[PDB]
């Protein structure tokens, strides 16, 4: 996260760290959506142009963390993966269209003060909240600039109008994406960056006071560049694929 701040303890209890077994390193963020399912970005697991192709046994999920590097004894839970599911039509070849993956944990995780699932939006929530100008929140242990934080970072960013998203890049934008960030005129900054991928873009419902995940940190060109924006996987748009995977497996 660039131009963010240290998160508060328990501020983002659905935040998951994707951790590589060997070498031991941070792979990506992710989010907890039930006691057994973790949501992340496909490019975190599979991206052939960089020879990236992780399997269940390459990874650990670490839930309930604050410190990036510390083993948070008695606080974090570490879990193994039973099964990874990548969206069938994930377009890694072109534009990271449908950049979404689900991960089933070997065993259910126990909820605590530090560990708690975020909600998935229904159609009404999405319609109501996904609007230009409305702000969401991104969290992660990623790079601080285009150098690494000791603690989970947080930043709040506005959803940007679609035409402005399109006109900022040469990449072909789809309905399965939205972009977020400040315009260069707005005089505030902030962006996700490397290491933040697969993390949650969340919004708090003013109707029922619940946090909902609207987006997944997906891609950008550099980090926090003027006139460039962060792109997020549009979660509600892919919800039928999510529901399908979950009640089928």
């Amino acid at each position: 996260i660039v131009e963010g701040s240290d998160a508060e303890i328990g501020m983002s209890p659905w935040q998951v760290m994707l951790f590589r077994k060997s070498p031991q390193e941070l792979l990506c963020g992710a989010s907890l959506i039930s006691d057994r399912w973790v949501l992340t970005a496909a490019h975190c697991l599979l991206y052939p142009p960089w020879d990236k192709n992780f399997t269940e046994n390459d990874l650990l999920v670490r839930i309930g963390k604050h410190s990036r590097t510390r083993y948070e004894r008695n606080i974090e839970k570490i879990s193994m993966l039973e099964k990874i599911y990548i969206h069938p039509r994930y377009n890694w070849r072109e534009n990271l269209d449908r950049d979404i993956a689900l991960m089933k944990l070997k065993k259910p995780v126990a909820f605590s003060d530090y560990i708690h699932p975020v909600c998935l939006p229904d159609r009404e929530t999405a319609a109501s909240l996904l609007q230009a100008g409305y702000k969401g929140r991104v969290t992660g242990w990623g790079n601080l600039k285009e150098g690494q934080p000791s603690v989970l970072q947080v930043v709040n960013l506005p959803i940007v109008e679609r035409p402005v998203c399109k006109d900022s890049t040469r990449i072909r934008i789809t309905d399965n994406m939205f972009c977020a960030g400040y315009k260069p005129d707005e005089g505030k900054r902030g962006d996700a960056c490397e290491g933040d991928s697969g993390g949650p873009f969340v919004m708090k419902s003013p109707f029922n006071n619940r946090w909902y995940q609207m987006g997944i940190v997906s891609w950008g060109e550099g980090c926090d560049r003027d006139g460039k924006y962060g792109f997020y996987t549009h979660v509600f748009r892919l919800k039928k694929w999510i529901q399908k995977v979950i009640d089928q497996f």
């Binding site: 077994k21 060997s22 031991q24 390193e25 941070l26 650990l60 590097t69 510390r70 083993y71 570490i78 193994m80």
Partner: peptide, 11 residues
């Protein structure tokens, strides 16, 4: 950089 984790998990 990363503190080692208990080893239960490096399976």
């Amino acid at each position: 950089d990363f503190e080692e984790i208990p080893e239960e998990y490096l399976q």
